[PDB]
Structure 1
Amino acid sequence: STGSATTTPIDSLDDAYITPVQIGTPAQTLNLDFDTGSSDLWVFSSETTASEVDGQTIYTPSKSTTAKLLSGATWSISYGDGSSSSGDVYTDTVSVGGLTVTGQAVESAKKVSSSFTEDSTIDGLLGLAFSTLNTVSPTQQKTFFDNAKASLDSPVFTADLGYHAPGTYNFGFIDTTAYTGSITYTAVSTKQGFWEWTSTGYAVGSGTFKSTSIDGIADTGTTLLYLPATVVSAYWAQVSGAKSSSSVGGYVFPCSATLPSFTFGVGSARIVIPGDYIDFGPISTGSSSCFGGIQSSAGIGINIFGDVALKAAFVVFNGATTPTLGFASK
């Protein structure tokens, strides 16, 4: 089997991407944030505290003939950005882009943190990291990809995120029309439950490439590119008037700037992030200070190849017995 779904930026900055997902019988379509950095599929629901719902579409398990309470199971998750959610669990039929899984754990939120409530465009998350990170207790649950894998034509999914445009998530096949050149594959560690890999180095603009190992995760659920402070300082040093602002919480730059590109290495291959991809717009409405798309990971404890990086590539998440990542230009 295969599936193919379009993913759409939630706003003009690409702060996140939403992908429609069919849950239940008859289908209830929710717009979920596909997150290769977490492993829970959770939704706003008829159980969510009413004051914490503001415009999201909810899953109502009592209206699905295939929904079953997963008795005793609860979940609770805290993300790296400080946001959180928790609740109970149903199993139900979940389809993405024509690919159906029966008996998928659908984690129903009873509580969500303010940043979820305040984002009316995201109806929940669909985790695509390794199932070892799933938070359901006392019986850990599998991701949608892990449940689908055996049925897929190839045990893979691909992320093709757009810059200020829609893109695609495919499951079970590699669309050879969607990228240029060849795909370079690189090793993955699953030891922390993430799609963790080692980049071979970086360049700033037309500068020389620096060969250096940068361990990090491929995380579609993180907006920005988070790298070591040395690398980030080298990038922003090429932008007149850029500075790290403790008050704003990262590097800012004059909105009048033309940003340089940023290149990262994948083995002997190179992915180029155009400068425009690194502009996240005014820090507040009407400001002439703009927020940078490359930020330090020093406060995180891991480097994160988020959407800024991933949207410059066609990315293969290879879930073979030994997982690997693939990157191609496009």
Structure 2
Amino acid sequence: STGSATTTPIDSLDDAYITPVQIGTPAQTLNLDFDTGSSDLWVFSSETTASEVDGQTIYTPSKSTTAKLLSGATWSISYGDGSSSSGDVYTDTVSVGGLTVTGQAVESAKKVSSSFTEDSTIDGLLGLAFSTLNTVSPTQQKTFFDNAKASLDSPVFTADLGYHAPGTYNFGFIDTTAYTGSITYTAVSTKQGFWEWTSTGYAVGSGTFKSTSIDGIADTGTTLLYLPATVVSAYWAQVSGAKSSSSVGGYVFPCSATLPSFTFGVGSARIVIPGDYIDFGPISTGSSSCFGGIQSSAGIGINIFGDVALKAAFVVFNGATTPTLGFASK
């Protein structure tokens, strides 16, 4: 089997991407944030505290003839941005782009933190990291990809995120029309539960490539590119007037600037992030200070190849017995 679904930016900045997902019988379609940095499929629901729902579409398990309470199971998750959610668990039929999994754990939110409530466009998350990170207790549950894998034509999914435009998540096949050149594959460590790999270096604009190992994670659920402070300083030093602002929370730059590209290495191959992809717009409405799309990871503990980086590539998440990542230009 295969599946193919379009993923759409939630706003004009590509702050996140939403993909329609069918849950239950008859189908209830929710727009979920596909997140290769986490491993829970959770949704706003008829069980979510009413004051914490503000415009989201909810899953109502009592209206699904295939929903079953997973008795005794609870979940609770905290994300790197400080947001969180928790609740109980049903199993139900879940379909993405024509690919169906029966008995998928659907984690129903009883509580969500303010940032989720405040984002009316995201009805929940669909985790695509390794199932060892799944938070369901006392019986850990599998991701949608893990459940589907054995049925897929090939044990892979691909992320093709658009810049200020829709893109595609495919399951079970690699669309050879969706990228240019060849796909370069690179090793993955699953030891932390992530799609963790080592970039071979970087360049700023037209500058020379610096060969240096940068361990990080491919994370569709993180907006920006978070890299070591040395790398990030070298980038922003090429932008007149750019500075790190403690009060804003990162590097800012004059909105009048034209940003240089940023290149990252994948083995001997190179992925070029155009400068425009690094512009996240005014820090507050009407400001002439703009927020940068490349930020320091120094306070995180891990480097994160988030959407800014991934949207410049066609990315293969290869879930073969030994997982690997592939990157192609597009």
Q: TM-score, normalised by structure 1?
A: 1.00
Query: Which structure 2 residue ranges, 5 or more long, are not aligned?
Result: none
Deviation string for 1:93-141 (max 9, x for gaps)?
0000000000000000000000000000000000000000000000000
Distance 1:179 1:59 in 2: 35
- Measure how far apart 1:155 and its partner are: 0.0
- Measure how far apart 1:83 and its partner are: 0.1
- Measure how far apart 1:92 and its partner are: 0.0
Q: Partner residue of 1:5? A: 5
Q: Partner residue of 1:300? A: 300
Distance 1:191 1:122 in 2: 29
- Measure how far apart 1:59 and its partner are: 0.0
- Measure how far apart 1:290 and its partner are: 0.1
- Measure how far apart 1:301 and its partner are: 0.0
Q: Partner residue of 1:190? A: 190
Distance 2:230 2:152 in 1: 42
Deviation string for 1:180-237 (max 9, x for gaps)?
0000000000000000000000000000000000000000000000000000000000
- Measure how far apart 1:277 and its partner are: 0.0
- Measure how far apart 1:50 and its partner are: 0.1
Distance 2:115 2:158 in 1: 28
Deviation string for 1:161-192 (max 9, x for gaps)?
00000000000000000000000000000000
- Measure how far apart 1:292 and its partner are: 0.0
Question: For 1:48-67, what aligned pairs fall within 5 Å after superposition?
Answer: 48-67=48-67
- Measure how far apart 1:15 and its partner are: 0.1
Distance 1:80 1:21 in 2: 24
- Measure how far apart 1:147 and its partner are: 0.0
Distance 2:290 2:14 in 1: 15
Distance 2:78 2:7 in 1: 24
Distance 1:248 1:58 in 2: 34
Distance 1:114 1:240 in 2: 36
Deviation string for 1:274-327 (max 9, x for gaps)?
000000000000000000000000000000000000000000000000000000
Distance 1:126 1:295 in 2: 25
Distance 2:327 2:78 in 1: 29
- Measure how far apart 1:81 and its partner are: 0.2
Distance 1:139 1:268 in 2: 42
Deviation string for 1:54-112 (max 9, x for gaps)?
00000000000000000000000000000000000000000000000000000000000
Q: Partner residue of 2:278? A: 278
Distance 2:25 2:203 in 1: 50
Distance 1:291 1:160 in 2: 24
Distance 1:95 1:17 in 2: 18
Distance 1:255 1:321 in 2: 47
Secondary structure of the 2:234 match is: helix
Deviation string for 1:148-171 (max 9, x for gaps)?
000000000000000000000000
Q: Partner residue of 1:169? A: 169
Distance 2:142 2:322 in 1: 18
- Measure how far apart 1:258 and its partner are: 0.1
Q: Partner residue of 2:93? A: 93
- Measure how far apart 1:255 and its partner are: 0.1
Distance 2:85 2:3 in 1: 28
Q: Partner residue of 2:160? A: 160
Distance 2:31 2:299 in 1: 31
Distance 1:104 1:244 in 2: 44
Distance 2:211 2:96 in 1: 39
Distance 1:121 1:232 in 2: 31
Distance 2:12 2:79 in 1: 23
- Measure how far apart 1:28 and its partner are: 0.0
- Measure how far apart 1:268 and its partner are: 0.1
Instruction: Find runs of 4+ consecutive structure 1 residues off by over 3 angstroms.
Output: none
How many pairs align?
330
Distance 2:248 2:85 in 1: 26
Q: TM-score, normalised by structure 2?
A: 1.00
